[PDB]
Each structure stands twice: as C-alpha cells, then as structure tokens.
A paper describes a structure:
The Omicron XBB variant likely originated through the recombination of two BA.2 descendants, BJ.1 and BM.1.1.1 a progeny of BA.2.7516. The recombination breakpoint is located in the receptor-binding domain of spike, and each region of the recombinant spike confers immune evasion and increases fusogenicity. Recently, the XBB variant emerged as a recombinant lineage between the second-generation BA.2 variants BJ.1 (BA.2.10.1.1) and BM.1.1.1 (BA.2.75.3.1.1.1; a descendant of BA.2.75)16. XBB harbors the substitutions R346T, N460K, and F486S, which were convergently acquired during Omicron evolution (the mutations in the non-S region are summarized in Supplementary Fig. 1). XBB.1 is the variant most profoundly resistant to BA.2/5 breakthrough infection sera to date and is more fusogenic than BA.2.75.
To observe the interaction between RBD and ACE2 with better resolution, local refinement was performed on RBD-ACE2 and reconstructed at a resolution of 3.29 Å. Similar to the RBD-ACE2 complex structures reported for BA.5 or BQ.1.1 bearing F486V2,5, the F486S substitution changed the side chain to a less bulky hydrophilic residue and lost hydrophobic interactions with the hydrophobic patch consisting of F28, L79, M82, and Y83 in ACE2. We have reported that F486V contributes to neutralizing antibody evasion by sacrificing affinity for ACE2 in the BA.5 study, and a similar result was observed in the F486S substitution in this study. S RBD Q493, which also interacts with ACE2 H34 in an alternative conformation. Similar to the other SARS-CoV-2 variants, the residues L368I, R346T, and V445P were not directly involved in the interaction with ACE2. Although R346T does not directly interact with ACE2, R346T lost interactions with N450 and Y451 forming a loop, together with Y449 interacting with ACE2, in XBB.1, compared to those of BA.2.75. On the other hand, in the XBB.
Numbering used by the authors:
A (entry chain B): 332 to 526
B (entry chain A): 19 to 614
The structure:
Amino acid sequence: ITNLCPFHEVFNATTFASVYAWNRKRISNCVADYSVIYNFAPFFAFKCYGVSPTKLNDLCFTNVYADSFVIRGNEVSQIAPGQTGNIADYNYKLPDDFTGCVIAWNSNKLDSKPSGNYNYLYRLFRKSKLKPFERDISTEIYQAGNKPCNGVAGSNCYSPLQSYGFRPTYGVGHQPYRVVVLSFELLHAPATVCG
Amino acid sequence: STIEEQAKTFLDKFNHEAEDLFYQSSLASWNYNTNITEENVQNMNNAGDKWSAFLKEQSTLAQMYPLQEIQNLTVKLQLQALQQNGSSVLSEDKSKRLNTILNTMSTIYSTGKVCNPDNPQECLLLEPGLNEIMANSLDYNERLWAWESWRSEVGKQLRPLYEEYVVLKNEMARANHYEDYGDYWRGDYEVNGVDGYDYSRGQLIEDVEHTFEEIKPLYEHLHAYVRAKLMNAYPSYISPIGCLPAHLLGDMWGRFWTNLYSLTVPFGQKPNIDVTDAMVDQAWDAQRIFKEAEKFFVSVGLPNMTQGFWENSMLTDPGNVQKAVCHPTAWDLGKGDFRILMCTKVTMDDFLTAHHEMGHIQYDMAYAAQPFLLRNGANEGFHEAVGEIMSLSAATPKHLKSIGLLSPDFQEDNETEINFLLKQALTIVGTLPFTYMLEKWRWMVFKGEIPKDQWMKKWWEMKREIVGVVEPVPHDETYCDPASLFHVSNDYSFIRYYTRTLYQFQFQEALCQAAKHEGPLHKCDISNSTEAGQKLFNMLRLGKSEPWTLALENVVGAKNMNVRPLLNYFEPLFTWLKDQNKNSFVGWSTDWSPYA
Ligand SMILES: *[C@@H]1O[C@H](CO)[C@@H](O[C@@H]2O[C@H](CO)[C@@H](O[C@@H]3O[C@H](CO[C@H]4O[C@H](CO)[C@@H](O)[C@H](O)[C@@H]4O)[C@@H](O)[C@H](O[C@H]4O[C@H](CO)[C@@H](O)[C@H](O)[C@@H]4O)[C@@H]3O)[C@H](O)[C@H]2NC(C)=O)[C@H](O)[C@H]1NC(C)=O
Ligand SMILES: *[C@@H]1O[C@H](CO)[C@@H](O[C@@H]2O[C@H](CO)[C@@H](O[C@@H]3O[C@H](CO)[C@@H](O)[C@H](O)[C@@H]3O)[C@H](O)[C@H]2NC(C)=O)[C@H](O)[C@H]1NC(C)=O
Ligand SMILES: *[C@@H]1O[C@H](CO)[C@@H](O[C@@H]2O[C@H](CO)[C@@H](O)[C@H](O)[C@H]2NC(C)=O)[C@H](O)[C@H]1NC(C)=O
Ligand SMILES: *[C@@H]1O[C@H](CO)[C@@H](O[C@@H]2O[C@H](CO)[C@@H](O)[C@H](O)[C@H]2NC(C)=O)[C@H](O)[C@H]1NC(C)=O
Ligand SMILES: *[C@@H]1O[C@H](CO)[C@@H](O)[C@H](O)[C@H]1NC(C)=O
Ligand SMILES: *[C@@H]1O[C@H](CO)[C@@H](O)[C@H](O)[C@H]1NC(C)=O
Ligand SMILES: *[C@@H]1O[C@H](CO)[C@@H](O)[C@H](O)[C@H]1NC(C)=O
C-alpha cells in the first residue's frame, strides 16, 4: 500500500471558496482509506445514501469526485436529493439517484471576524432552474421589468450575486458551515480505486 | 411579468439588506448601553443615521408599485408598512423645526431641576429625590411645594412648544390621508381586506367607552375605601364627599397607587408574603434565579435559551468605571442573537422581573421565521400582555411552595387573600381611569374641539369628573401640566396599557381554563400543563401575518376586548369592598375645591 488517496487536501484546506463557484476534484489511481475522515471534529451531519458507511472499504468504484463549498448553518438540510429551496435549485443541484455521503462541520472560529465577512457570495436570482451537477459564474444584471436594463442597475435591475455576512456573535443557524460532498459512480472501465 | 412578482423580488432584496443594517445598529446601541463612552455615542449616531437613510431611500423607491394590483394580502401589508414608516411629506424647514422642537422637549424634560423652597442654595432632580419624597414623605406642605414647583417649572417653558408641536403634527397628518394625528395614532388597530374580521378606526373609542362604563363601579368602591383610609391618615384636609387632593396620591402624577399600601393595608397583623429572607438564607444568586425562570418556562413545553444568550447577556451590575443603565430591557438584535440587560439584586421584585423579561424574550424568539417586516407583535398590546401574564402566574403561593422558597407550613385564608388582591388592585385598577382620561384629552386636543384658552379648564373639569381628583392649587393657562409627563413630552402613544390590561386577563383566563384549573382564578398555576403552552405558542408563532382579531379568536373564542375576565378576577375583593362601604357614601363631589 503506497499510493494513499489523499483526502487531507480536500479537507484541511483553509479555503473553501464560494458556493456559487464550487471546486471539483477528481480522485483516481490511488488506494482510498476513508478512516482518515473520522479524525476531525464531530460532524454536524454525516449522511450516506447509497452505500453503508461500514462497508466503504469493501466496495470500490471507477472514480470518486469531491466538491467543497461553504454555506449557512440552516441550509444544510437542502444539500440532499429531492430537496427544494434557493441554494439547492440555484447554486448546487443534486440528482435523484445520488450515491455518496454528505459531510458538514462548523467553522465559526475559522470563518468569522468581528468586522464582518463579505468573501462568501451566493446567487439570489436566475432566469431558470439548474440541471443536476451544473455550475454558473455569469454575472449579469437580472432584468425583472419590461424595459431593458441596458446593463445598469436601478429600478427593476438587480445584481444576481449577494454576499453573506459572518460575525462571531451570530447565533446557531447563521454561522458558517463547511460542506464536503463525495460521489461514487460506474462506467465501462476498471475500477482500480480501493484498498 | 406582473406587479406582484416585481414587488416580491424587491421585498426579497430588502429583507436581506435590512437584517444586516438593523443588526449593526442594534449592536452599536447595545455597546453604548453597556458602555457609556463618547466613542460609543458616535458609533450609535453613525449606525442610526445609516439605518434611517437606508429606510428613507427604500421607502422612496417603494412608491412605484400601486397597491390595487396585489392580492396576496401579505406583500400589500409589507409595502404599506414600508411606505407608512419611511415616507415624509414635510418641507425641509418644517422638518428641521419639528426635530428641533422634539430635541428641545427631550432635553428640557431630562435636565429639568427644581430647587429647594425659597432658597437658591440647592436644586434637586426628579428621579433622585423628588420621587422618593413623593413616595415616602408624609409632609403635606413639602408634597404641595414639590408638586406645584415641579409642575410650574416644567410646564411654563413647554406650553408654547407644545402648541407649535401640535400645529406641526396636525399639518403633517392633514398632508397625509388621515384626518388628524389622533386618527393617525388610532390607525394601528385598523384591520382591512378581510371579511368577518374588519375593524374601523372609529370603533376603538366606542369600545373603550363601553369598557369604562362597565368597569366604573369597582373603581368607585375602591376610591371610597381609599378615601376613608386617607381620612384616617390625614384628618383635617380631606372632605367627606369631595375629591382627593392630587398631591397625596403617593407619586408625582397619580399613575400608580402602589405606595399607599402601607396606609391602606386591610389586615396589617397578618404576615406578608415575602421570600427575600428565604433567598438570603438559601444563598441564591442571579444565575440561579435565571435558571429557575428558564426551568419554569421549560415546564410548559416551550424551548429554552441557547448558549449565546448565557454567554453574552449581562445580569449583574458591573460597577467600578463601567457604568450602564440599569432599567431592565429585553434585546432582540436579530439574526438569532437574543440578550437581556438588567442590574439584578436578590429580591422578589427582581425574581418576578426575570420572568417578565423572559416572556418578552420567548415572544421575540417565537416569530423568528416570519419576514423582517412581519417580525413584530399583532399590535401594541399583545407584547406587553404576553410579558405580564407570566409575572401574574409566577407570584402564586403554589409556585413558591413548589420552588421551595416558601415554607410548606404556610397557610392561606381570608386575610392573606384579601391583602394580596388589594395590593394587586392598587397597582392595576388605579391607572385605568388615568390612562383613559389622558388618551381622551389628547384625542380631543388633536381633533381641535378644545381651544388653547380652555385647555386647562377642560383638563381640570374632567379631572374632577372622571378620576375624581381635584387640584390642590388653582392654575391659569400659563402652565402645561400634561407636558410634565414623560410619554406626553416624548410623543408616545398611551392606549397600549389600557388594551394590555384587558388582554392579559383574557389570556390568563383562557390558559387557566385550558389547564383544567378549578377554584378561584387568582390561585392558578400553568407550570406543568402542556396544552396551554401549546395554544400560547400557536398564537405566538403567527406574528403580524394574521389579524389581531383572528389571533384573539384563536385564543379565547372572541373578536373583541372584554372586561368580564377582570371582573371575575376581582369579584372576591369586590364583595368585601361592598361589605366595608356600608357607612360611607359612594361618589365624589365636583363642586369641592380644597383651596376654598
Ligand atoms: C417604524 O418606525 C417606528 C418609529 O416611528 C418604530 O417604532 C418604535 O418601535 C419600538 C419597538 O416597539 C418602540 O420601542 C418601545 O419603546 C418603549 C418606550 O420606552 C421608553 O421609555 C423607557 C423607560 O420607561 C426607556 O427605557 C426606553 O428606551 C424608551 O425611551 C419601550 O418601553 C418599549 O419596551 C417595552 O418592551 C420591552 C421588551 O422589548 C420591555 O422590557 C419594556 O419594559 C417595555 O415594556 C419598546 O422598546 C418605539 O417606542 C417605537 N417608536 C415610537 C416613536 O413609538 C418601529 O420599530 C419601526 N418599524 C420597523 C423598523 O419595522
Ligand atoms: C403569497 O406569496 C407567498 C410568497 O411566495 C406565498 O408563500 C409561498 O407558498 C408556497 C406554497 O405554500 C411555499 O412553497 C413551499 O416552499 C418550501 C420551501 O421554502 C417547500 O419545502 C414546500 O414544499 C413548498 O413548495 C413558499 O415557500 C411560500 N413562500 C414564502 C416566502 O413563504 C403564498 O402562498 C402567496 N399567497 C397566495 C394566496 O398566493
Ligand atoms: C468600554 O469602553 C471603552 C472605551 O470605548 C473600551 O476601551 C476601548 O477598548 C478597545 C478594545 O478593547 C480599544 O481599541 C480602545 O482603544 C479602548 N478605548 C479606550 C478609551 O480605552 C473598553 O474596552 C470597553 N469595555 C468593555 C468591557 O468592552
Ligand atoms: C410539576 O412537576 C414537578 C415535578 O413532577 C413538581 O415538583 C415537585 O413539587 C412538590 C410539591 O408539590 C415537591 O415536594 C417536589 O420536591 C417537587 N419535585 C421536583 C423534582 O421539583 C411540581 O410541584 C409540579 N407543579 C405543580 C404546580 O404541581
Ligand atoms: C490543516 O492541517 C494542518 C496540519 O495537519 C494544521 O497545521 C492546520 O492548522 C490545519 N488547518 C485547518 C484550517 O484545519
Ligand atoms: C433546557 O436546557 C437544558 C440545559 O440547561 C437542556 O438539557 C434541555 O434539553 C433544554 N430544554 C429543551 C426542551 O431542550
Ligand atoms: C372569613 O372567613 C370566615 C370563614 O368561616 C367567614 O365566616 C367570614 O365571613 C370571612 N370574613 C370575610 C371578611 O370574608
């Protein structure tokens, strides 16, 4: 056992970006040991859908994808198949047959300052819904009135991206939370990622 | 698309911006209130200026959307709130004059000082010494001097300011669609757009008058008994059939009659219900008191405090260089941050105040899910009634025995119950005629029925008529007695207390009946029942979304205020008062004037 699949980079990264632009990491060609995940602080929500947590080491797949982003405390329940709500249907949409586990732990001490945090943005308006596993970065004036916005803000012309705000004195449910999502899948190719 | 969606998007943006701005402003205000420094004053000023400005531009932008195209009946409410509370229609000079008048009135009331009689050596302030003198001093001459000097020196300056102020407020109200400032004030209770629950701004006056007509006899019997006791106290001055002198009511203005308990105790020989010695013996402290209150709140099934409340709330006097205002308050900074500010001592008064403030905190927590413009009580009385019902329930001997402070060997009977009822009455019943008179006079003066040259004559005429209190010294139109009150000087509505008095007793009767209670109403405990708490929470979670008439129906099965719960509560004292008033004529005489 030499090539350990390294998860302490997707975790333990000191930077998780914004939810509206979430990073994606492809893990392959290594030996995967999931015991290293349980070495961190107590997890707020450890939910596995398609695989038993005890048997993660007894089955293996072709490739594994890891996604990381930061959201509010009370929108964690929305990162799940079949859920409906702003964050789920505008920033990160999951499919119905999703197979994997959802990881979320609090980071209030690390992602908050008394002055205020404005480096964690999220989308508020969009013309249409999002297909599963889709990403959007376009920043244009969301026109709501009949008269064209002409690329300027004002009456019935609003910016789509709006930023969070994080202070140490916020109550539970508004404090920042760090979320990591693991995905497993199949295709006509050797698996080669387990051990 | 449609006006409804175009307004929904705007409301969605405003909801997110307002929360952040309000949180910043509230944090600055809390920092100043816990830390009195010039830098904190500047921070509060900056935060308030930013919040007021932002509200102004948001209200200005909200005028684009007409109301007649909306049928959600909720977006309409939010837009109406924004417009009403952010619109200004006055010119710049008139607005500056109005703000200057308000600031001058507040400064004069705050810094007003009276000096010792016929002496320029020393001058005293209202709160430190005048309140104590009015509460405790039995000197007729001293009380009369303090009353006359204070009222003259506060009203003679503020009378023309009040005239200009009422002129400006009437102009502003007439610029708006309301008839006058009285109608503007009364518009709070108006409910429109719903069938079977509509309310009119003019119905409030009729309802208040009907309730007062029903409540008069208890007040007149209590007045007769208090007159007899005050005659026993001061022999010479009081007249058998005349009104009581104003300066002998135990306070500055006559709002409360609590200070007369020592003179008017029915059965003094019986021991009084006091647990301060018990708390001292058991070595209680503020944290223990608050934990006991939280346990009582949990016992009914409501959720309890988070860790942030305990971590941030201050419950002790800082002392040393750190000085803070010690008036108990319940703070709702928003965004899940709830704090309580209070300088606490080991007394039963503070023990009850803990429950009183915790009730407001729970009510604030209840409607956290509602939108920003709806995170408020149904009207101006619901919040106070919810705060007061818990204090009403927490004073029972059953609760005191269950906690363990009261000795189990304590027994209750005739005289304990009557003393407790009279002590409660002297605080609750006495203020109602005063509040009704003050609100009626303010409504009349705002309407314009009472001319300026007859303001004082009408004031003292209804003083002789309704409350049955006669002035000790004659006054001309130079004085301004009503302006001597804090609420009158600082432009606050005054019918909220009158509404709360009935609302609290209706809620208490409903909860006691839900808890399957039996026996007299004044011995009722709801600590262990889990159905009354469920009903109360069901009402609390609504917020401003539903009409207050609908909420009141959901609670008590009624669509209007009533006084029958109060009469049922005070009937045991009423029978004893009827028994004791056998040889005393009931009723005051208006023709009597103490100054010959
Ligand atoms: C729309 O804009 C209006 C401004 O025109 C805002 O209206 C204000 O609303 C607040 C919230 O209700 C009102 O605040 C209340 O003020 C009362 C006045 O008390 C004065 O006197 C006491 C001393 O007796 C002082 O300590 C205090 O600071 C005041 O100077 C308070 O008594 C009220 O407190 C009550 O509740 C608390 C619990 O929260 C209890 O602990 C208290 O004992 C008391 O029962 C309350 O704080 C304010 O008066 C309103 N302004 C005016 C001019 O009437 C709206 O908020 C705004 N709406 C928005 C932004 O949505
Ligand atoms: C007036 O407008 C409001 C605002 O849209 C309407 O309230 C909305 O009602 C719908 C349906 O009850 C709610 O949808 C629900 O959303 C949750 C997630 O938030 C989802 O889990 C549920 O399954 C359901 O789809 C919607 O949230 C709610 N909006 C708000 C802001 O509360 C209301 O219905 C309108 N009234 C009329 C008479 O049209
Ligand atoms: C009470 O207020 C004083 C003055 O506002 C605070 O002293 C300030 O403390 C901050 C940070 O602690 C410093 O940056 C300032 O320079 C200090 N100012 C002065 C004039 O000393 C004090 O810390 C406050 N007390 C509490 C408990 O917050
Ligand atoms: C609510 O229930 C609690 C616990 O079941 C009661 O608390 C007891 O009260 C009796 C007095 O009746 C005391 O002798 C016990 O020591 C108490 N036990 C505890 C654990 O507190 C409480 O009395 C009940 N409330 C009412 C109003 O009866
Ligand atoms: C990441 O891990 C390293 C060492 O394992 C540690 O020094 C660092 O503090 C960690 N940072 C975070 C944000 O967990
Ligand atoms: C009340 O607080 C205590 C801790 O002080 C906690 O154990 C209890 O669960 C809380 N009540 C409820 C209903 O959660
Ligand atoms: C006191 O209680 C006794 C009980 O028998 C009753 O006879 C008496 O009339 C009561 N007195 C008053 C003033 O209620």
